[PDB]
Amino acid sequence: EVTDNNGVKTIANNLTSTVQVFTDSDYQLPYVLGSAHEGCLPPFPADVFMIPQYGYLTLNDGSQAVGRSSFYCLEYFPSQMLRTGNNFQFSYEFENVPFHSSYAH
Amino acid sequence: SPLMGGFGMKHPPPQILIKNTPVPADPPTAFNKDKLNSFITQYSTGQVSVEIEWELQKENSKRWNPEIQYTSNYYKSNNVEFAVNTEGVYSEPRPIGTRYLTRNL
């Protein structure tokens, strides 16, 4: 928790506040991984990184939406609440993707 | 995929060719080797029934903006859409597509 009194930054932790985590495990959200968006994990392990913000795009006739323009509300998904003593874990099985070509002809 | 739309099948449902057999009218008393071109005019009638079970793929999108659907306009008009005219002729006013729901790429 960050407190700002007279421009003095005092940072004391909340042993009660919760942080939500959930995985879009049915791809029913607009997939935004896959354009090399600069928010990915730090090349050097020690490097502490800031988690990038999630914001999608939909249809747009100019800058105005259309009827098909979808609005996915993230909280409408079953989250999981971690509150400083819990951990999250999902195991994912990669589908049969062909071997990449690591060789020059 | 046939460019007019539909399904491309290597073995589509077969043709059902129907012919009502010739019945020669009255061949001569004396023999004659020709093809006996004098048949009695006739036709047929019946019913034909085609039961063709489809398989669906139900939709489970987590979209929050209401989907776009196909409806028949509520407004007074001389004839109901897709309903017979005063003379009995069945009139279809507009072609109906099959792409109304929305699924993200």
Side-chain angles (χ1 to χ4, degrees):
Chain A
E1 183 178 1
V2 161
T3 298
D4 186 359
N5 52 343
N6 297 336
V8 174
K9 194 76 72 176
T10 61
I11 291 155
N13 53 352
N14 274 28
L15 302 155
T16 50
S17 171
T18 78
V19 61
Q20 310 183 24
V21 173
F22 86 97
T23 64
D24 176 18
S25 179
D26 291 331
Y27 322 103
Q28 60 206 330
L29 278 160
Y31 204 78
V32 301
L33 282 64
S35 301
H37 277 102
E38 197 210 330
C40 297
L41 262 59
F44 194 38
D47 284 1
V48 64
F49 72 113
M50 185 180 288
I51 293 172
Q53 189 173 353
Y54 176 78
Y56 44 99
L57 277 296
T58 63
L59 280 76
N60 44 297
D61 168 28
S63 74
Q64 301 150 299
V66 298
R68 316 178 184 282
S69 172
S70 43
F71 163 52
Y72 299 95
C73 177
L74 272 296
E75 286 88 344
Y76 194 40
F77 286 62
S79 297
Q80 168 170 358
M81 271 175 161
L82 304 90
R83 62 180 294 165
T84 191
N86 291 355
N87 54 354
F88 178 68
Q89 168 180 7
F90 69 95
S91 173
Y92 173 68
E93 180 61 2
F94 278 84
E95 71 158 8
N96 207 303
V97 58
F99 276 176
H100 186 249
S101 297
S102 162
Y103 62 92
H105 281 267
Chain B
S1 66
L3 306 188
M4 294 182 286
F7 310 94
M9 281 185 258
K10 209 102 172 165
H11 292 303
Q15 305 170 100
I16 309 98
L17 304 105
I18 175 166
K19 166 182 177 286
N20 51 4
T21 51
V23 294
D26 53 355
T29 304
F31 181 86
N32 214 9
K33 76 191 318 293
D34 285 329
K35 328 185 312 300
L36 201 46
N37 54 3
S38 64
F39 310 98
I40 56 179
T41 58
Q42 67 175 19
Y43 63 91
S44 309
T45 318
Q47 288 82 18
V48 62
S49 67
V50 187
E51 153 181 354
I52 173 164
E53 171 198 271
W54 315 80
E55 183 178 1
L56 313 186
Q57 188 196 350
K58 295 294 180 189
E59 61 86 20
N60 56 8
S61 68
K62 307 293 278 206
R63 174 178 154 134
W64 188 277
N65 189 350
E67 295 85 3
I68 175 172
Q69 310 261 35
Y70 171 56
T71 187
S72 67
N73 296 115
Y74 180 101
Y75 196 46
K76 61 193 177 59
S77 63
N78 272 6
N79 307 326
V80 178
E81 276 191 348
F82 298 87
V84 291
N85 210 0
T86 77
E87 309 154 352
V89 296
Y90 173 89
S91 63
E92 284 178 349
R94 78 177 69 88
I96 305 174
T98 198
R99 330 175 86 67
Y100 280 114
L101 284 192
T102 80
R103 174 161 140 171
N104 48 278
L105 272 179

